[PDB]
Amino acid sequence: TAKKFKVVTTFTIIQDIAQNIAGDVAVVESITKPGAEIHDYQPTPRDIVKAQSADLILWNGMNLERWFEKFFESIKDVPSAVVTAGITPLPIREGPYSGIANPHAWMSPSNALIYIENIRKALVEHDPAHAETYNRNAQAYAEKIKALDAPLRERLSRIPAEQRWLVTSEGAFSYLAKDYGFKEVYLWPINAEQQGIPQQVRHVIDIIRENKIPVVFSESTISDKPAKQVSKETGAQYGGVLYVDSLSGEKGPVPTYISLINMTVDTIAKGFGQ
Ligand SMILES: [Zn+2]
């Protein structure tokens, strides 16, 4: 066991999934820090250094990392793989990014099985000496992720179907909302320039009042102020922060992808009174 194979991912969700497949034979690091906003992140010369010293680079695609392709052309002779191949996208519904793929495909546990398989294939292709380890680690982790779905599905099924309105800040939850049958309401369709402008806030306020939706949420990499303004003006409680675009730090409450899905579903269910 000389040097461990080095994998660099764009953001922390992919880091944790990939590290479970890598096990003990590769080290996986994320370019972005826990808590950092990932869509419009601005890479630095230190990020270039980290990617250039990798043996493999992994990114989401599906219009997530607006910085990645320009960043990756600075990198020489390091292979890359997009980990969302074979996932059917949901289009963004409005705004300047309307009609392109919503990147947040990892919020569906069923989609996460495809993430696992794509990362396994990339590690097996670019580090073939360790293929048996990657294959065994991916099979074990996919078992965990597959078993994850049933308790989450049952928990959220407790909410009456016509009350399943998921009101968030970024429209980051479309794939989870589809899996578990929630109608989707958000203050902005995807992180970008405008986030909590008027018109956005008022439309969401209107939908909450018409349907008496009991709760509204924010997310861990953006500002909680728009969601709190929405809850102040309506009958909705502020349900707290959901995790979607980043893990917490390793010593925080959301250290892993599994903990992210569990925590987001728990916080939603609690917002509806379980
Ligand atoms: Zn996002």
Swiss-Prot record:
**Main localization category:** periplasm
Residues that coordinate or bind Fe(2+): 39, 104, 170, 245
Cellular compartments annotated: Periplasm
* Keywords in alphabetical order: Ion transport, Iron, Iron transport, Metal-binding, Periplasm, Signal, Transport
User: MF terms per GO, please?
Assistant: metal ion binding
Q: Name one GO cellular component term.
A: periplasmic space
Q: Which GO terms describe its biological process?
A: cell adhesion; cellular response to iron ion; iron ion transport
Q: List the disulfide bonds.
A: none
Q: Could you tell me what this protein does?
A: Part of the ATP-binding cassette (ABC) transport system YfeABC involved in iron import. Binds iron with high affinity and specificity and delivers it to the membrane permease for translocation into the cytoplasm. Also binds Mn(2+) and Zn(2+).
Q: Give the family from UniProt.
A: Belongs to the bacterial solute-binding protein 9 family.
Quaternary state and interactors: Monomer.
Domain comment in the entry: There is a second metal binding site (site 2) involving Glu-125 and His-126 which can bind Mn(2+) or Zn(2+). It is unclear what its physiological function is but may participate in protein-protein interactions with other metal- binding proteins.
- Annotated protein name in UniProt: Iron-binding protein YfeA
Organism for this UniProt entry: Yersinia pestis
The uppermost taxa in this organism's lineage are: Bacteria, Pseudomonadati, Pseudomonadota, Gammaproteobacteria, Enterobacterales
Gene name as annotated: yfeA
